[PDB]
Design a protein around this nucleic acid. Structure first.
Ligand SMILES: [Mg+2]
Ligand SMILES: [Mg+2]
Ligand SMILES: [Mg+2]
Ligand SMILES: [Mg+2]
Ligand SMILES: [Mg+2]
Ligand SMILES: [Mg+2]
Ligand SMILES: [Mg+2]
Ligand SMILES: [Mg+2]
Ligand SMILES: [Mg+2]
Ligand SMILES: [Mg+2]
Ligand SMILES: [Mg+2]
Ligand SMILES: [Mg+2]
Ligand SMILES: [Mg+2]
Ligand SMILES: [Mg+2]
Ligand SMILES: [Mg+2]
Ligand SMILES: [Mg+2]
Ligand SMILES: [Mg+2]
Ligand SMILES: [Mg+2]
Ligand SMILES: [Mg+2]
Ligand SMILES: [Mg+2]
Ligand SMILES: [Mg+2]
Ligand SMILES: [Mg+2]
Ligand SMILES: [Mg+2]
Ligand SMILES: [Mg+2]
Ligand SMILES: [Mg+2]
Ligand SMILES: [Mg+2]
Ligand SMILES: [Mg+2]
Ligand SMILES: [Mg+2]
Ligand SMILES: [Mg+2]
Ligand SMILES: [Mg+2]
Ligand SMILES: [Mg+2]
Ligand SMILES: [Mg+2]
Ligand SMILES: [Mg+2]
Ligand SMILES: [Mg+2]
Ligand SMILES: [Mg+2]
Ligand SMILES: [Mg+2]
Ligand SMILES: [Mg+2]
Ligand SMILES: [Mg+2]
Ligand SMILES: [Mg+2]
Ligand SMILES: [Mg+2]
Length: 149
RNA sequence: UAAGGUGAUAUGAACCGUUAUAACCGGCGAUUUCCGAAUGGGGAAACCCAGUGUGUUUCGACACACUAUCAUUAACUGAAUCCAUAGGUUAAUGAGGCGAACCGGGGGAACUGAAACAUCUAAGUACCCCGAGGAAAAGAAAUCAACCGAGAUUCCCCCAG
RNA sequence: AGGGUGACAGCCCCGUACACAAAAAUGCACAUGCUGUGAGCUCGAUGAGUAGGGCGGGACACGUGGUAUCCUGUCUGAAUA
RNA sequence: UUUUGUAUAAUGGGUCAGCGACUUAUAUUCUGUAGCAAGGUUAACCGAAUAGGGGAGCCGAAGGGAAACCGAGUCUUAACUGGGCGUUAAGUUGCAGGGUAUAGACCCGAAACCCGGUGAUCUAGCCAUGGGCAGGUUGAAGGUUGGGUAACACUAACUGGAGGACCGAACCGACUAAUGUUGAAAAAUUAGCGGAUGACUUGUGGCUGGGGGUGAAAGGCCAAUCAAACCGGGAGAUAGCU
RNA sequence: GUUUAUUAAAAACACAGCACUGUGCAAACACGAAAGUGGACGUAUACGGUGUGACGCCUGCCCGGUGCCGGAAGGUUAAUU
RNA sequence: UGAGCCUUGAUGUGUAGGAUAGGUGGGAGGCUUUGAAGUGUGGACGCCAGUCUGCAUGGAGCCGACCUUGAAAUACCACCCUUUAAUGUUUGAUGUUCUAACGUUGACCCGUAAUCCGGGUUGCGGACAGUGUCUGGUGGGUAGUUUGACUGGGGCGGUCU
RNA sequence: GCUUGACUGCGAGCGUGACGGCGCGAGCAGGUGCGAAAGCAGGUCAUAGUGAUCCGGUGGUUCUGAAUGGAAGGGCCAUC
């Protein structure tokens, strides 16, 4: 009886080694005590599906993991404004909370559920990113100029 | 359909009817005790004894109906033992037994004949058993043929003692 | 035809030949209505513990014989247009 | 009737009447008869149904040889002077008949073998549940008391009531004789006889089924049947016999 | 005590006792294709089979034959291969 | 304790010789810091000459055309005849151990108000036992049968061409 | 003394048997032996010394050969 081993049997094989086992050994021990299952040339592809499918979903991720490290040295230059003053002390505003104010003039109608948003809340007069509020995804522009009096 | 009828041995009695519910004949209904597969349980067949549920101008008790077994299915329930399964309750469907022969299948003699007898014969007969049907079975070539060809099965006549 | 009728009846009676008959039920046939089953064309597929084998038996007219073929109780066991 | 042979005192028949035994089917051969004739004839079937169709086939016209093969010849043999079988001889289909074959095969008739059922209301054994044994005898163990024993033992009397115990009715049986023998009775009667608290007997019900049962064993009993029950079937077994 | 119901009641059968043998329990053995049942709700002081047949004195020699028991060296020896 | 087997490792004195020459092709040097040569030595072979090989120390050396010889190097390779070493593995035998088939007419639990059965748990046996097919033996336990004729009856005896 | 006629194929005609069969047999062909030759020889002076068939075995024989070629098997002759 040709069986495929579901686990290491000592004197036979190792997690798939199709061996010729006496039918009583398989019928009464290896199959009920789940060390094996018979080699029907469907189980040679159905639980060697763990040999086939769980291996076959690794060759394309091996190729898809090559196109992810392709966009690495593209940008490599960012407008960094937190100057290393008298020998490099951190006080400024670069990362992980909130930048809004002055580039709200940025296209055609959006909502406030699409902004990605690092620390500098822009109490330093500059131009940073807002989403102005109606619609789901598209970018938005609305400019007003307060006439002083 | 009718002028005659109330089956027979089998008269008589008491009646029915005669121009259309007398009787007679036929179709479709209806009633159809008890036993018997007998099926509510039992049983020495035609008897005994229940249970549940419905109803009943006397509350002494009555009337009706249902209640077998197996299979299949489904629903609800539910062990050892977590799920689960077994199991259990109900409901629905079907079966059950009988019957002459023919039919298919499962089993299968001996007398006898061989001028004895064992191989052989009788004979896959008789008989037992299961199952089915109006017929059953068989049946659409993994068949024959003989280099030509035929073209499922079954039955009859030959081939041929 | 046949059966009766006081002995043998074509013409006495019942019948017979022939021609008619159905409220109702029901069958075998045709057409049709409904609900089931899916024809026709294309590429494909083509029945494995099986065929075959060993042992034992049975069936084939054929008694194991030089005995093909079929069935299979037992042990085995292919090929796949 | 059977026999060498029967008045035979060998068989059979009381008599009458009625019934009672060489058949039928299909094949084969011979005879007769009819038809056709080197041809004869169809079978199933179709059907215009005893017609007609249908010639599938069958027999015949050629044999010889194991056969291939040859062919009025052939085989034998290396081959025949030869020898064997053949050639010089009309068959065929009906009808009728004589025989043969297969079938029950002229009729009757076994003992028996096999298959499937029915039977333990008789009997045999067992199981369960109930009943029966008048009356009279015998007097075991044990017990009590007294004696006796160092104590046991042992012993006498009284008691006690054992036993496939004794005598003997019911009850169960059946040793002898006679009767009876077409009986009163398909096993009894009569006079006697054995057992009679037991391995007893009996009632009711139950179980064991035929090569099986049961058997204190006789091949005994299993429904008046037993060296293989009864009933039905195979079955008209077979019968060189009467 | 039992027996040939229906020609034999006996010296026959049985019997207590004796012996041999088997049987370790899912016992041997028996009825059963089998399940199972009896043996036995018993367990070797038990059960089955065989023979002998109270009791008393006894039961002698023969293992070549046949059987049974045990042995397993070698010889021969089946299916199978 | 018996045999097979891919693959590699090892078995080969006519004499010519520095001495343990099966053969053809492939060739001018292979092996040696994942370790050389000169020594000791384990278990084998042995024509007694020395080869094969394990292990330890060792640290820069063993081996050619050779002079000879029908054949010239285990200098690297490749195929393969004679020879015997070794496993994975192949099937053989006996014994031991195991458990997971199988058995349980052991215990407990549930089905289940059940000494049946089944399931479960566990223990004990355990690849035995037991059963099927095949097979030799035994087998009046049972069955079917045979066991001649002549014959001054039959049998005994004799005879049978 | 020499030899294999204890030949092969046949066989007119006879004898004897219910039959199966058994027996006698001149002569013909072929090929042998002995004899100078005529001739003789197909076992032994004769009459006993034997066993049907079936089933098979051996050898020979392209007789047959289940589509065809072969073979198996069968037949024929010899023989067990
Ligand atoms: Mg009832
Ligand atoms: Mg009832
Ligand atoms: Mg006979
Ligand atoms: Mg026979
Ligand atoms: Mg063609
Ligand atoms: Mg075939
Ligand atoms: Mg076979
Ligand atoms: Mg055959
Ligand atoms: Mg006389
Ligand atoms: Mg006279
Ligand atoms: Mg007189
Ligand atoms: Mg007389
Ligand atoms: Mg007289
Ligand atoms: Mg008389
Ligand atoms: Mg008369
Ligand atoms: Mg007989
Ligand atoms: Mg019988
Ligand atoms: Mg019967
Ligand atoms: Mg009695
Ligand atoms: Mg007494
Ligand atoms: Mg009286
Ligand atoms: Mg008296
Ligand atoms: Mg008395
Ligand atoms: Mg006697
Ligand atoms: Mg009687
Ligand atoms: Mg008899
Ligand atoms: Mg009958
Ligand atoms: Mg008769
Ligand atoms: Mg007495
Ligand atoms: Mg008597
Ligand atoms: Mg008497
Ligand atoms: Mg005695
Ligand atoms: Mg003695
Ligand atoms: Mg012995
Ligand atoms: Mg006998
Ligand atoms: Mg005689
Ligand atoms: Mg002489
Ligand atoms: Mg051929
Ligand atoms: Mg052929
Ligand atoms: Mg031949």
């Amino acid at each position: 009886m040709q069986v495929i081993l579901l686990d290491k049997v000592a004197n036979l094989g190792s997690l798939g080694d199709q061996v010729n086992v006496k039918a009583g050994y398989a019928r009464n021990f290896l199959v009920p005590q789940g060390k094996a299952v018979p080699a029907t040339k469907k189980n040679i592809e159905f639980f060697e599906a763990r040999r086939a499918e769980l291996e076959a979903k690794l060759a394309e991720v091996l190729a898809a993991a090559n196109a992810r490290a392709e966009k690495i040295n593209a940008l490599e230059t960012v407008t960094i404004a937190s100057k290393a003053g008298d020998e490099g002390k951190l006080f400024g505003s670069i990362g992980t909370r909130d930048i809004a104010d002055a580039v709200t003039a940025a296209g055609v109608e959006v909502a406030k559920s699409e902004v990605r948003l690092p620390n500098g809340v822009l109490r330093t007069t500059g131009e940073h990113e807002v989403s102005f509020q109606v619609h789901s995804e598209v970018f938005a522009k609305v400019i007003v100029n307060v006439v002083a009096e």
